[PDB]
Structure 1
Amino acid sequence: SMEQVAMELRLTELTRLLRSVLDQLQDKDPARIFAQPVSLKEVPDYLDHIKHPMDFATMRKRLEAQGYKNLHEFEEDFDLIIDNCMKYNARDTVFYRAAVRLRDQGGVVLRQARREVDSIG
């Protein structure tokens, strides 16, 4: 039906917006600490600590399949990247501190992204 096509066009345009958001958020991680999933070869106990791992490459895979139906779902995955890092790694590490900075700089991007999603519908 035409109503289904219109819903699919809205999802397509959301996906385009979230791709711009994701690129901007990943620019705030120039070290590429959060670019890939935590390797279970290199960190064998990781799943004992973190139950829902997340990273930018995993988010990009879901995004290109139009897997994010709204901004909240996208935000939940971005928050996992930060929140998992700040639990596993201690306060005095480069990893924890990179997550703090990504959160702080990322909040600026997500604030305006919310306004664009609401405005454009």
Structure 2
Amino acid sequence: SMEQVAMELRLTELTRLLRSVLDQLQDKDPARIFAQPVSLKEVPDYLDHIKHPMDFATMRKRLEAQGYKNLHEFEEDFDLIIDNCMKYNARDTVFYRAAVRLRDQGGVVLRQARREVDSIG
């Protein structure tokens, strides 16, 4: 149906805008602390602590399969990256501090993305 097409075009356009959001969030992580999954070979206990691991590579796979239906879904995954790191790592660590900075800087970006998603539809 043409209706099914039109819905697909909207998903595609949301995917475009989410890719640009994702690029801009990832630039706020020049250290690449959140670029890849935590390795279960190097933190064998990770899954006893963290139930839903997340990282920018995993978000990017989902994005390219058009797996985010709305901005809320995408934000949930971004928040997992931050929130998981702030639980596993202590306050005095380069990891926790990197998550706080990514959260603060990412807030700015997400605030305008929400306006753009509402604005364009």
Q: Provide the C-alpha distance between the structure 2 equivalents of 1:105 and 1:91, rounded to a whole number of angstroms.
A: 18
How many aligned positions are there? 121
After superposition, give the CA deviation of every residue in 1:30-49 in whole Å (9 maximum; x if it has no partner).
00000000000000000000
Compute the displacement of 1:79 (Å).
0.1
CA RMSD of aligned residues (A): 0.1
Compute the displacement of 1:75 (Å).
0.1
Report the 3-state secondary structure (helix = DSSP H, G, I; strand = E; otherwise coil) of the residue aligned with 1:100. helix
TM-score scaled by structure 1? 1.00
After superposition, give the CA deviation of every residue in 1:49-97 in whole Å (9 maximum; x if it has no partner).
0000000000000000000000000000000000000000000000000
Any unmatched runs of 5+ in structure 2?
Answer: none
Compute the displacement of 1:102 (Å).
0.1
TM-score scaled by structure 2? 1.00
Report the 3-state secondary structure (helix = DSSP H, G, I; strand = E; otherwise coil) of the residue aligned with 2:35. coil
Compute the displacement of 1:119 (Å).
0.2
Report the 3-state secondary structure (helix = DSSP H, G, I; strand = E; otherwise coil) of the residue aligned with 1:110. helix
List 4+ stretches of structure 1 deviating above 2 A. Answer: none
Any unmatched runs of 5+ in structure 1?
Answer: none
- Percent identity between matched residues is 100
Match of 1:53 in 2: 53
Q: Provide the C-alpha distance between the structure 2 equivalents of 1:43 and 1:31, rounded to a whole number of angstroms.
A: 19
Compute the displacement of 1:12 (Å).
0.1
